[PDB]
């Protein structure tokens, strides 16, 4: 199995049903046709206060294939549409088809800049077991960020320090504690295609 309580076995598409009941899902997802991730929809952060967390099943890196009626083929959906399916408030329960890759399927790149003193990166971060997921960003701060980073990316390391499983106070102090050379290590989901187009 019943979707309401089905466990998530690795490497098997599982159809699940999640209690939402008008409360936010609270996930950060990536994927879209104009997106840096063009191969699927992937959870890069779970808010502890939201309904995904209250369900206890989904993890970071889970690949979302279908939401309700809609199969989530990001090749033919906007980044907006993708994100907005997860931020809608739904009245009852939501069905999802999920795939947990083991091992996980990721891209790993680097982003380097020379930050100017008192000119923010324009990033708002959410800390987790992988690193600091980017929750939102103001474009136009640093050319490097626009072309190489988007909402949903996970910053794994900042100027040498591993960001994995660190308190927000700690993360925020590290980022605000730099004015000069910036060396960011980044993990981004790259699922293999499990979706066909309409």
């Amino acid at each position: 199995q019943e979707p309401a309580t089905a466990e998530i076995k690795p490497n098997k598409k599982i159809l699940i049903e999640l209690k939402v009941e008008k409360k936010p899902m609270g996930v950060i997802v990536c994927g879209g046709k104009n997106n840096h991730v063009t191969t699927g929809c992937v959870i890069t952060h779970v808010y502890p206060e939201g309904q995904v967390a209250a369900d206890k099943r989904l993890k970071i890196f889970d690949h979302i294939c279908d939401i309700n009626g809609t199969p989530i083929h990001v090749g033919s959906m906007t980044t907006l549409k993708v994100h907005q399916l997860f931020h809608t408030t739904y009245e009852k329960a939501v069905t999802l088809t999920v795939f947990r890759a083991d091992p996980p399927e990721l891209e790993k790149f680097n982003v380097d800049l020379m930050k100017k003193a008192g000119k923010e990166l324009g990033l708002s971060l959410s800390p987790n077991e992988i690193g600091c997921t980017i929750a939102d960003l103001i474009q136009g701060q640093y050319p490097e960020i626009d072309s190489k980073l988007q909402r949903g990316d996970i910053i794994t390391k900042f100027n040498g320090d591993a960001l994995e499983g660190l308190p927000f106070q700690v993360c925020y102090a590290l980022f605000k504690g730099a004015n000069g050379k910036v060396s960011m290590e980044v993990t981004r989901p790259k699922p293999t295609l499990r979706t066909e187009a309409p």
């Binding site: 923010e120 990166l121 324009g122 990033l123 708002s124 971060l125 929750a135 939102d136 103001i138 927000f168 925020y172 980022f175 605000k176």
Partner: peptide, 9 residues
Amino acid sequence: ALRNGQYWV
């Protein structure tokens, strides 16, 4: 900073 309810770096 804190601006419109969020923390920015």
